Amino acid sequence: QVTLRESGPALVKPTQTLTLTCTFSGFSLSTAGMSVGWIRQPPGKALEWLADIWWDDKKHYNPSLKDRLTISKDTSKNQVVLKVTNMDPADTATYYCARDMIFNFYFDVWGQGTTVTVSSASTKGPSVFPLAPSSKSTSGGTAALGCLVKDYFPEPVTVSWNSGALTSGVHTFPAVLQSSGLYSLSSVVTVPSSSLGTQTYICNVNHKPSNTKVDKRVEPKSC
């Protein structure tokens, strides 16, 4: 199928340049009528179109950002690059590449997005702590357990349970920037208390910006 995937650094310092790459397959950017475009989205704000490139190397830019943007293609590697110079806090966003065609002039297939944060602060891996089930994390016939994912920077972090095999009753909370300037979140799973022994519980945490990967067993505490 037609697929696109964005890559680039999670973190850039103010005044530095950002380089993003979109790698695509299931189509070619030498094929007449084909375009790849870049779209961004600041945390909880509207989508904003940035740039596009066409099979014939025609380029277009959003006029407010034009002085800061350069789009380029390498047909030979199925890649499109966007360079954004002089990054500032307003450039913190999720960056999307998408496919457009001359028949459409709309983005029909999108990549999954890559998160970029513009900050002075250093990368930091999370500490991962279990939220052990007990009588106190029981309500009716429901038990709760979880993992506290504490003191990381920047976004994002991923959390799954039992390598993604356990999915129902899972609630992974959105990260909050703490007063210390580092992120924290919990991920919790609910199960009927008399159903707890059906499996063990492992939260797999991955912070790709610090190359950190932690597995944590969450068991009941003893005396």
Binding site: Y106, F107, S137, H171, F173
Partner: protein, 213 residues
């Protein structure tokens, strides 16, 4: 440049309700397109060329309009329609998106289940103590959580986080996290999370004594 407004900014409606979202462009465009964005996902093409359904979209959704005024219609709103919807013009450069409309599902009142977790011994060795209070599967979103520590009401050391509305049952979940230093934590016995919500006739308290099983 061709710019668009979207109305309303936020919409709450029941399952089965007819929903209408409008887009108004600064000058006439030949087509308007529509995207559906779930939280933590890429936007998905929903309607293209004003009226055409994109692949996999149920018949429930339809688009209409011309010139500057366009309409996205959901004839019978379903729990899985919780999203932000954007209009998009690609008729002329620069390409532009409307401000977005967030659609939430109105449901019957459901009381939170309340759960408390003391800090782990692993966190306590590393020098901090986080007390987590969990409110699970409730509606509406609005909820008050108060921490009491040895019968003192806490302020400015607790943070909340709330899930996006659940795509099957339309309920929310919330975490309230109380953070102290290990030193402050070990000074005190009774840790209590007190929860006020529409679905509970009186506040609910979960508490533990520090140091017990």
């Amino acid at each position: 440049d061709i710019q668009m407004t979207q109305s309303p900014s936020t919409l709450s409606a029941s399952v089965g309700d007819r929903v209408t979202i409008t887009c108004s462009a600064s000058s006439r465009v030949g087509y308007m397109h529509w995207y559906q964005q779930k939280p933590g996902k890429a936007p998905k093409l929903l309607i293209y060329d004003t009226s055409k359904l994109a692949s996999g979209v149920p018949s429930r959704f339809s688009g209409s309009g011309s010139g500057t005024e366009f309409t996205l219609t959901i004839s019978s709103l379903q729990p899985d329609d919780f999203a932000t919807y954007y209009c998009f013009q690609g008729s002329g450069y620069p390409f532009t998106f409307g401000g977005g409309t967030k659609v939430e599902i109105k449901r019957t009142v459901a009381a939170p289940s309340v759960f408390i977790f003391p800090p782990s011994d692993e966190q306590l060795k590393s020098g901090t103590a986080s007390v987590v209070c969990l409110l699970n599967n409730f509606y509406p979103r609005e909820a008050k959580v108060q921490w009491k520590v040895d019968n003192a009401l806490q302020s400015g050391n607790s943070q909340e986080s709330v899930t996006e509305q659940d795509s099957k049952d339309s309920t929310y979940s919330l975490s309230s996290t109380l953070t102290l230093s290990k030193a402050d934590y070990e000074k005190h016995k009774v840790y209590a999370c007190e929860v006020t919500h529409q679905g509970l006739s009186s506040p609910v308290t979960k508490s533990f004594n520090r140091g017990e099983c």
